[PDB]
């Protein structure tokens, strides 16, 4: 017997589905039988994050083949796989570590989600879970404005390059994590503050709500970040949307809308290798050749809604097809909204 409406329900359902978690590490050909779920643990995930840096530190140093090897073989002691008929791949090149650096990130949310589930007896079922995620959950009426703005925002900002879906709103949630309002006050003050997507995977969304979205730790290998480690965002929803990984056999995905206190942006057309940043720039923005239309710009309790369509920039010599954002605190980000949306693939 559940008090909380039918979509937040539904909600909670698909973000702490245990089979998805076991799916996701099927996907990522994990060995279950040596490392099932319920032994996933942060410390061994951090070590192994520790030897992804030690392999990305072989590979620049020019480390002999066996030094390399051996490393990679530890990180295959760590977290056991099954590859079946082709070998595990040697970790020896920024992509193998990258992709092992990524699939490591996603690990340690689905830790994060079945430890939660696995925690601490007379409350409904949807709802005691619901209370895990420390999070303030409530849906958006379909016929308010506030829902026609974000609808018009995922309309519009739809990349012309992205053409392998197209985009449906199923729910709009409003979120308030729990002292994220707090925590977001300092930069309340800063200048510039936007409304943007940032796009996971669903076996994220536990972690992502209990515990804000998080930078990447050190231990983490410093290789793969177009701007370094901190927390990206974009002005086109499909560019955040390519990050929910949905495909034809779960095409429904989730999407966040954070308020990004941007400041005074640091403008960049290609990969910069600060972490650290200039004195009196608060984020980096990477500049893309397409730009959500300025013109059409909203102000919103004083937040900018960039939900123009996309046309050119201007901006020539770039690395970049859109606009991203990147903000190296986690202070700077305040949660607003959590889109269920529908995936129609071609
Ligand atoms: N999530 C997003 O919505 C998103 C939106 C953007 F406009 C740019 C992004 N870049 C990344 C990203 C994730 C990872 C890296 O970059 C580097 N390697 C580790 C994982 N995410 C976005």
Known sequence: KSKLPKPVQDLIKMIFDVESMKKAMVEYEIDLQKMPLGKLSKRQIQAAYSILSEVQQAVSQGSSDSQILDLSNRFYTLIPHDFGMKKPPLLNNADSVQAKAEMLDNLLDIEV???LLRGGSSKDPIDVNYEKLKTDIKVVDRDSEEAEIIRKYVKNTHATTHNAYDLEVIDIFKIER???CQRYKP???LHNRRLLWHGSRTTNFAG???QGLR???P???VTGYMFGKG???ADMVSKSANYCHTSQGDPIGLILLGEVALGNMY???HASHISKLPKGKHSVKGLGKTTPDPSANISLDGVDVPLGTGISSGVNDTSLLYNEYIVYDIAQVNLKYLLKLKFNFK
């Open 113 to 115: 989600a079945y430890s």
């Open 178 to 180: 729990e002292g994220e």
């Open 187 to 189: 930069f309340k003050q």
């Open 208 to 210: 992502i709500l209990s």
């Open 215 to 217: 930078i990447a730790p």
């Open 219 to 221: 231990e983490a290998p």
């Open 231 to 233: 927390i990206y965002f």
């Open 267 to 269: 403008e960049l057309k």
